[PDB]
Amino acid sequence: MEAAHSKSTEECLAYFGVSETTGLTPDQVKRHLEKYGHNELPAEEGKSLWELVIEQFEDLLVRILLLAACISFVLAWFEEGEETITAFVEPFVILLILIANAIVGVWQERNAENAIEALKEYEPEMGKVYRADRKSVQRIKARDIVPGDIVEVAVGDKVPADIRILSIKSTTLRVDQSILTGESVSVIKHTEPVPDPRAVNQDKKNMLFSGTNIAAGKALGIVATTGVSTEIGKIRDQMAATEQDKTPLQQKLDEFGEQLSKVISLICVAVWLINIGWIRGAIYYFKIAVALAVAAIPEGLPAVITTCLALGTRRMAKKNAIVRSLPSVETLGCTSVICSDKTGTLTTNQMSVCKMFIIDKVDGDFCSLNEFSITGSTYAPEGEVLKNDKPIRSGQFDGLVELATICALCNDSSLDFNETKGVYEKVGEATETALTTLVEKMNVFNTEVRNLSKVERANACNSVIRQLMKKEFTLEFSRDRKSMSVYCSPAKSSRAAVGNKMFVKGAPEGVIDRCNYVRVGTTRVPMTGPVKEKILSVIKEWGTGRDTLRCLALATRDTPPKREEMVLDDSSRFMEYETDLTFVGVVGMLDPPRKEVMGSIQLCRDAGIRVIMITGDNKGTAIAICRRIGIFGENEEVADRAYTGREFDDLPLAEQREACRRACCFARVEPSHKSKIVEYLQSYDEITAMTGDGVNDAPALKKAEIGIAMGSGTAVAKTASEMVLADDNFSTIVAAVEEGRAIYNNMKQFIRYLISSNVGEVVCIFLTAALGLPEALIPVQLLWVNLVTDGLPATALGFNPPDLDIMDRPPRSPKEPLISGWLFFRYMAIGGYVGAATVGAAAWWFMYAEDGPGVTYHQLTHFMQCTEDHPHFEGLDCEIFEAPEPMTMALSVLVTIEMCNALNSLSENQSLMRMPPWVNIWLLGSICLSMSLHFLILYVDPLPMIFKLKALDLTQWLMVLKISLPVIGLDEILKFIARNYLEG
Ligand SMILES: Nc1ncnc2c1ncn2[C@@H]1O[C@H](COP(=O)(O)OP(=O)(O)OP(=O)(O)O)[C@H]2OC3(O[C@H]21)C([N+](=O)[O-])=CC(=[N+]([O-])O)C=C3[N+](=O)[O-]
Ligand SMILES: FC(F)(F)Oc1ccc2c3c([nH]c2c1)[C@@H](NCc1ccc(Br)cc1)CCC3
Ligand SMILES: [K+]
């Protein structure tokens, strides 16, 4: 049933064929389950495992490795002679590593997915329905509440569906629906039809929305829509699925992927070309092509990448930064401008009326004032009211009595006592509750409150004013006039002839212009120029002083219009109905900046991040706040870097864009302006973190490259967001950007470490083919390196502790190459030394090791010419070239160097003498475990037969360290030219 908000109780009942006492029949339930599905957000769709395999097949390197599989398969098939046929392990392993990688990408594609699942969290487990089974209410699983059944809800329950209220059983019904509308005040719900069929949800005051909770009361309704049809379920309809564009790192990695394709193909052609001058031969340059493919591809890199991301996500997630979109962590390092709202994010949103003034005397041009101050900054109703630092019984001033009345009446919020926490808490809007607390502190009628209870005391004095003036109706706040008013009539009935009143509170600018009189206690004197000046002179002093107060003016229309001649259907006339007012006084409440923000702001400048503050204060106060928290200097001229929504809109398009180039402070912007500022910032290739919590903030969060939504905010903003501030703190953003920087510098390290490791293997294979030597590494050994003995240090590298200057450098540009020009030189030379060292390791055994045959280099590089007992190969067994020992020398050198390179990769440019190995203790363990797995693979008797290895003696090991360790002295020397001859 659509638009049930416009239909009467009887109509919705007549629509579904239900009784308000009998409920639904099980037969009706079956029929509805069929015609409406269950009451839940359906499981993820559009994702096919088989169709996902196509994406893996489409990737280039997967195509290569898949081709290396079929080759390795046919090679093991054909080569029955001179080897055991139980040697299909290599093609099998190739497939498994390919299968594993497919699983891996899918496995945490669900981590990039379920970002939108943060909305599935808002629906409840259970609900209550009256049904045709029992005369009492049955508690059903919420996902089985079909449309049409009668639902009961009480205090503190979650509304389990979208329900048209049928009959409120308690006195009144208040519904917290902030989660869906942003309404920070519990809405009064009624049972009448709201007439407009397309009215906004804020007007649907007869509807219960799923996912919202009941502030107070108890009602009975009938389910109008379930699951997706609900307004909270309408949020899932977009379901992302927008244009998906590769991240900059994803794009760069793929360019390396194809340069790797070119390089493999060329080497493959070169060795087929070098061999100048058959079945046994067709084997060779296919075997090495497999050895080539396996040696070039990092194999385990996606596993390491998606792991260090997951652990970084949880690191950030415990710093109150909830990463929805995973590509964000890359983007977070490139953040050039954070643009955030003031209230609740730069400040505590913990309101307290700090100062207030009424008029003292008026003589001609002169106008004195009675200024008051109030101790206590919590919502607790405790503290003095001060005049000249001394206590004052507020009720002695008739001007304060009227101020207290206006505050208590121009108010839709209240105070509550949390029985468990033992503290006073905010009900409804924070800025209104500040007035509630102020009234209780003033106590203008000297209501006896001492012997009350912590609960009763919360609203005693507010209730006393409610006992005097009966709030007939309210004139809602509009932004054109920046004020609201309430029409009240006397309720004592014993007291006579007071008359109907209208109490107006609003921004001092507009309210004061619509005043014609100033109340002096109980007397009335017309509004004059000299007095209005002194009023604004203190309002401006307060909103610009060291305490930076938002100010509110309180007024009264002494003679309101005829209640039967006011038309409440159109806001446009509301301002006129608040004319001929009498200025009563002004309250000034503080909302102090969070302890951290001043320092957190400083970091953004040190790191080259511009901070734009969007706020609703006046341009005067907005500028002042920016000096207080440090966006501007106290003595700096900020004329050109602070704008208002109307000022900004006055500039032509060209002058608009130049403003965002330099601006840092926006006051009172329309909703559309956030999205317009982002567009302008994009025109300068600036990468923006933009914050929002409200329902209108959605498009500027989809548009911003890093949409940041508030944890206490609406559901829609969270959905359009890339990240969520669980603690609402602005410093959580800075900490998020900082962490996002460290992670990329660590991804860069293990990317280089793994790929430079790959280079050494490609060199080793290439020399073997070029020199005609026997194979020194076989693909099974390489995969064990590129997946295990390298993967563990590669991961632990991602935990390299951040640089000390990490927040003293400009944002990384999105086009920043993975390697500089010189890094290409450094890693080629190391990958070269790694290639030569592994081949020489095996050659040393064949020619010089005591256990080895001690053959000559001509013999060794013609080892396949050992057809029979040759005169050339005198005293040798042909098989000695297939011996496990030379391979195990090479693999042991490849492993040991990659442990040393891991120690080198601890820093891109720092010596190990300055930043020692134990700086990353997680990395030491990764090396201890990789080496352990190497001794395991040599010593547990199923394993050596597989990988074709044999345990080295003490001599052969000391030869590995003889060979391997200099790679440290090589990189240390290479790191020297960097920090001493390249930058200067
Ligand atoms: N586009 C705008 N043009 C003009 N003023 C704007 C605009 N947007 C917001 N304001 C005013 O600024 C006040 C608080 O803004 P501020 O807390 O700085 O930031 P926001 O709460 O708007 O943003 P956030 O909640 O953090 O997303 C609001 O209080 C009030 O009017 C609102 C308000 N209200 O929002 O309901 C009621 C009120 N009385 O008296 O009822 C007085 C306000 N006031 O004096 O500012
Ligand atoms: F060895 C397998 F083929 F099985 O696994 C891999 C290992 C590494 C890569 C690489 C790619 N496909 C691979 C597939 C290519 N793009 C896939 C990819 C893109 C971004 C991220 Br993050 C991870 C992988 C480009 C080089 C890196
Ligand atoms: K976005």
JSON list of N, CA, C and O and ligand atoms in Angstrom, two decimals, residues 59 61-62 65 97-98 101 249-250 253-254 256-257 297-302 305, ligand 2:
[
{"chain": "A", "resi": 59, "resn": "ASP", "atom": "N", "xyz": [42.26, -10.75, -17.10]},
{"chain": "A", "resi": 59, "resn": "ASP", "atom": "CA", "xyz": [43.52, -10.16, -16.67]},
{"chain": "A", "resi": 59, "resn": "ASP", "atom": "C", "xyz": [44.69, -10.77, -17.44]},
{"chain": "A", "resi": 59, "resn": "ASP", "atom": "O", "xyz": [44.69, -11.96, -17.76]},
{"chain": "A", "resi": 61, "resn": "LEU", "atom": "N", "xyz": [48.17, -11.07, -16.73]},
{"chain": "A", "resi": 61, "resn": "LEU", "atom": "CA", "xyz": [49.12, -11.96, -16.06]},
{"chain": "A", "resi": 61, "resn": "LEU", "atom": "C", "xyz": [48.48, -13.31, -15.75]},
{"chain": "A", "resi": 61, "resn": "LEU", "atom": "O", "xyz": [49.15, -14.35, -15.85]},
{"chain": "A", "resi": 62, "resn": "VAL", "atom": "N", "xyz": [47.20, -13.32, -15.39]},
{"chain": "A", "resi": 62, "resn": "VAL", "atom": "CA", "xyz": [46.49, -14.59, -15.21]},
{"chain": "A", "resi": 62, "resn": "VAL", "atom": "C", "xyz": [46.50, -15.39, -16.50]},
{"chain": "A", "resi": 62, "resn": "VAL", "atom": "O", "xyz": [46.71, -16.61, -16.49]},
{"chain": "A", "resi": 65, "resn": "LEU", "atom": "N", "xyz": [50.05, -16.89, -16.73]},
{"chain": "A", "resi": 65, "resn": "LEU", "atom": "CA", "xyz": [50.25, -18.00, -15.80]},
{"chain": "A", "resi": 65, "resn": "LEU", "atom": "C", "xyz": [49.36, -19.19, -16.14]},
{"chain": "A", "resi": 65, "resn": "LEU", "atom": "O", "xyz": [49.77, -20.35, -16.00]},
{"chain": "A", "resi": 97, "resn": "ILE", "atom": "N", "xyz": [47.66, -22.07, -7.20]},
{"chain": "A", "resi": 97, "resn": "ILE", "atom": "CA", "xyz": [48.03, -20.68, -6.98]},
{"chain": "A", "resi": 97, "resn": "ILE", "atom": "C", "xyz": [47.16, -19.76, -7.82]},
{"chain": "A", "resi": 97, "resn": "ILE", "atom": "O", "xyz": [46.80, -18.65, -7.39]},
{"chain": "A", "resi": 98, "resn": "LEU", "atom": "N", "xyz": [46.80, -20.20, -9.02]},
{"chain": "A", "resi": 98, "resn": "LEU", "atom": "CA", "xyz": [45.84, -19.45, -9.82]},
{"chain": "A", "resi": 98, "resn": "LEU", "atom": "C", "xyz": [44.46, -19.50, -9.18]},
{"chain": "A", "resi": 98, "resn": "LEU", "atom": "O", "xyz": [43.78, -18.47, -9.07]},
{"chain": "A", "resi": 101, "resn": "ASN", "atom": "N", "xyz": [44.43, -17.26, -6.06]},
{"chain": "A", "resi": 101, "resn": "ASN", "atom": "CA", "xyz": [44.34, -15.84, -6.37]},
{"chain": "A", "resi": 101, "resn": "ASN", "atom": "C", "xyz": [42.92, -15.44, -6.73]},
{"chain": "A", "resi": 101, "resn": "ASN", "atom": "O", "xyz": [42.43, -14.39, -6.30]},
{"chain": "A", "resi": 249, "resn": "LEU", "atom": "N", "xyz": [46.63, 3.28, -8.11]},
{"chain": "A", "resi": 249, "resn": "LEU", "atom": "CA", "xyz": [47.56, 2.17, -7.92]},
{"chain": "A", "resi": 249, "resn": "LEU", "atom": "C", "xyz": [47.16, 0.97, -8.77]},
{"chain": "A", "resi": 249, "resn": "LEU", "atom": "O", "xyz": [48.03, 0.27, -9.31]},
{"chain": "A", "resi": 250, "resn": "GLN", "atom": "N", "xyz": [45.86, 0.71, -8.89]},
{"chain": "A", "resi": 250, "resn": "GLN", "atom": "CA", "xyz": [45.40, -0.38, -9.76]},
{"chain": "A", "resi": 250, "resn": "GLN", "atom": "C", "xyz": [45.82, -0.14, -11.20]},
{"chain": "A", "resi": 250, "resn": "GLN", "atom": "O", "xyz": [46.22, -1.08, -11.91]},
{"chain": "A", "resi": 253, "resn": "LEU", "atom": "N", "xyz": [49.80, -0.58, -11.45]},
{"chain": "A", "resi": 253, "resn": "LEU", "atom": "CA", "xyz": [50.19, -1.98, -11.38]},
{"chain": "A", "resi": 253, "resn": "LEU", "atom": "C", "xyz": [49.97, -2.69, -12.71]},
{"chain": "A", "resi": 253, "resn": "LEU", "atom": "O", "xyz": [50.74, -3.58, -13.09]},
{"chain": "A", "resi": 254, "resn": "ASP", "atom": "N", "xyz": [48.92, -2.30, -13.44]},
{"chain": "A", "resi": 254, "resn": "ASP", "atom": "CA", "xyz": [48.61, -2.95, -14.70]},
{"chain": "A", "resi": 254, "resn": "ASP", "atom": "C", "xyz": [49.56, -2.51, -15.81]},
{"chain": "A", "resi": 254, "resn": "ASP", "atom": "O", "xyz": [49.88, -3.31, -16.70]},
{"chain": "A", "resi": 256, "resn": "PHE", "atom": "N", "xyz": [52.71, -1.88, -15.29]},
{"chain": "A", "resi": 256, "resn": "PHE", "atom": "CA", "xyz": [53.80, -2.80, -15.02]},
{"chain": "A", "resi": 256, "resn": "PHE", "atom": "C", "xyz": [53.46, -4.22, -15.47]},
{"chain": "A", "resi": 256, "resn": "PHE", "atom": "O", "xyz": [54.35, -4.99, -15.83]},
{"chain": "A", "resi": 257, "resn": "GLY", "atom": "N", "xyz": [52.17, -4.57, -15.45]},
{"chain": "A", "resi": 257, "resn": "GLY", "atom": "CA", "xyz": [51.78, -5.91, -15.87]},
{"chain": "A", "resi": 257, "resn": "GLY", "atom": "C", "xyz": [52.07, -6.18, -17.33]},
{"chain": "A", "resi": 257, "resn": "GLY", "atom": "O", "xyz": [52.42, -7.29, -17.71]},
{"chain": "A", "resi": 297, "resn": "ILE", "atom": "N", "xyz": [56.17, -13.05, -12.55]},
{"chain": "A", "resi": 297, "resn": "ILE", "atom": "CA", "xyz": [54.91, -12.64, -11.94]},
{"chain": "A", "resi": 297, "resn": "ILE", "atom": "C", "xyz": [55.04, -12.65, -10.42]},
{"chain": "A", "resi": 297, "resn": "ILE", "atom": "O", "xyz": [55.51, -13.64, -9.85]},
{"chain": "A", "resi": 298, "resn": "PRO", "atom": "N", "xyz": [54.64, -11.58, -9.73]},
{"chain": "A", "resi": 298, "resn": "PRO", "atom": "CA", "xyz": [54.79, -11.55, -8.27]},
{"chain": "A", "resi": 298, "resn": "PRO", "atom": "C", "xyz": [53.95, -12.58, -7.54]},
{"chain": "A", "resi": 298, "resn": "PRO", "atom": "O", "xyz": [54.20, -12.85, -6.36]},
{"chain": "A", "resi": 299, "resn": "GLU", "atom": "N", "xyz": [52.94, -13.16, -8.21]},
{"chain": "A", "resi": 299, "resn": "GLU", "atom": "CA", "xyz": [52.18, -14.29, -7.71]},
{"chain": "A", "resi": 299, "resn": "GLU", "atom": "C", "xyz": [51.44, -13.99, -6.41]},
{"chain": "A", "resi": 299, "resn": "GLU", "atom": "O", "xyz": [50.20, -14.02, -6.37]},
{"chain": "A", "resi": 300, "resn": "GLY", "atom": "N", "xyz": [52.18, -13.71, -5.34]},
{"chain": "A", "resi": 300, "resn": "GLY", "atom": "CA", "xyz": [51.61, -13.44, -4.04]},
{"chain": "A", "resi": 300, "resn": "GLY", "atom": "C", "xyz": [51.31, -12.00, -3.73]},
{"chain": "A", "resi": 300, "resn": "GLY", "atom": "O", "xyz": [50.77, -11.72, -2.66]},
{"chain": "A", "resi": 301, "resn": "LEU", "atom": "N", "xyz": [51.63, -11.08, -4.64]},
{"chain": "A", "resi": 301, "resn": "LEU", "atom": "CA", "xyz": [51.40, -9.66, -4.39]},
{"chain": "A", "resi": 301, "resn": "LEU", "atom": "C", "xyz": [49.95, -9.32, -4.04]},
{"chain": "A", "resi": 301, "resn": "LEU", "atom": "O", "xyz": [49.73, -8.56, -3.08]},
{"chain": "A", "resi": 302, "resn": "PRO", "atom": "N", "xyz": [48.93, -9.80, -4.77]},
{"chain": "A", "resi": 302, "resn": "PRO", "atom": "CA", "xyz": [47.55, -9.48, -4.36]},
{"chain": "A", "resi": 302, "resn": "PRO", "atom": "C", "xyz": [47.22, -9.97, -2.96]},
{"chain": "A", "resi": 302, "resn": "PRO", "atom": "O", "xyz": [46.49, -9.29, -2.23]},
{"chain": "A", "resi": 305, "resn": "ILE", "atom": "N", "xyz": [48.83, -7.44, -0.66]},
{"chain": "A", "resi": 305, "resn": "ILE", "atom": "CA", "xyz": [48.15, -6.15, -0.75]},
{"chain": "A", "resi": 305, "resn": "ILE", "atom": "C", "xyz": [46.84, -6.18, 0.03]},
{"chain": "A", "resi": 305, "resn": "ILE", "atom": "O", "xyz": [46.59, -5.33, 0.90]},
{"chain": "B", "resi": 2, "resn": "LIG", "atom": "F1", "xyz": [49.89, -15.48, -10.10]},
{"chain": "B", "resi": 2, "resn": "LIG", "atom": "C1", "xyz": [48.63, -15.13, -10.34]},
{"chain": "B", "resi": 2, "resn": "LIG", "atom": "F2", "xyz": [48.52, -14.89, -11.65]},
{"chain": "B", "resi": 2, "resn": "LIG", "atom": "F3", "xyz": [47.86, -16.18, -10.07]},
{"chain": "B", "resi": 2, "resn": "LIG", "atom": "O1", "xyz": [48.25, -14.08, -9.51]},
{"chain": "B", "resi": 2, "resn": "LIG", "atom": "C2", "xyz": [48.51, -12.76, -9.84]},
{"chain": "B", "resi": 2, "resn": "LIG", "atom": "C3", "xyz": [49.58, -12.09, -9.20]},
{"chain": "B", "resi": 2, "resn": "LIG", "atom": "C4", "xyz": [49.85, -10.77, -9.50]},
{"chain": "B", "resi": 2, "resn": "LIG", "atom": "C5", "xyz": [49.08, -10.05, -10.43]},
{"chain": "B", "resi": 2, "resn": "LIG", "atom": "C6", "xyz": [49.05, -8.72, -10.98]},
{"chain": "B", "resi": 2, "resn": "LIG", "atom": "C7", "xyz": [48.02, -8.65, -11.87]},
{"chain": "B", "resi": 2, "resn": "LIG", "atom": "N1", "xyz": [47.37, -9.87, -11.94]},
{"chain": "B", "resi": 2, "resn": "LIG", "atom": "C8", "xyz": [48.00, -10.75, -11.05]},
{"chain": "B", "resi": 2, "resn": "LIG", "atom": "C9", "xyz": [47.71, -12.10, -10.75]},
{"chain": "B", "resi": 2, "resn": "LIG", "atom": "C10", "xyz": [47.66, -7.39, -12.66]},
{"chain": "B", "resi": 2, "resn": "LIG", "atom": "N2", "xyz": [46.45, -6.68, -12.19]},
{"chain": "B", "resi": 2, "resn": "LIG", "atom": "C11", "xyz": [45.68, -7.35, -11.11]},
{"chain": "B", "resi": 2, "resn": "LIG", "atom": "C12", "xyz": [45.65, -6.57, -9.83]},
{"chain": "B", "resi": 2, "resn": "LIG", "atom": "C13", "xyz": [45.37, -5.20, -9.82]},
{"chain": "B", "resi": 2, "resn": "LIG", "atom": "C14", "xyz": [45.35, -4.48, -8.63]},
{"chain": "B", "resi": 2, "resn": "LIG", "atom": "C15", "xyz": [45.62, -5.14, -7.45]},
{"chain": "B", "resi": 2, "resn": "LIG", "atom": "BR1", "xyz": [45.59, -4.15, -5.84]},
{"chain": "B", "resi": 2, "resn": "LIG", "atom": "C16", "xyz": [45.91, -6.49, -7.41]},
{"chain": "B", "resi": 2, "resn": "LIG", "atom": "C17", "xyz": [45.92, -7.19, -8.61]},
{"chain": "B", "resi": 2, "resn": "LIG", "atom": "C18", "xyz": [48.87, -6.43, -12.82]},
{"chain": "B", "resi": 2, "resn": "LIG", "atom": "C19", "xyz": [50.17, -6.89, -12.12]},
{"chain": "B", "resi": 2, "resn": "LIG", "atom": "C20", "xyz": [49.90, -7.53, -10.76]}
]
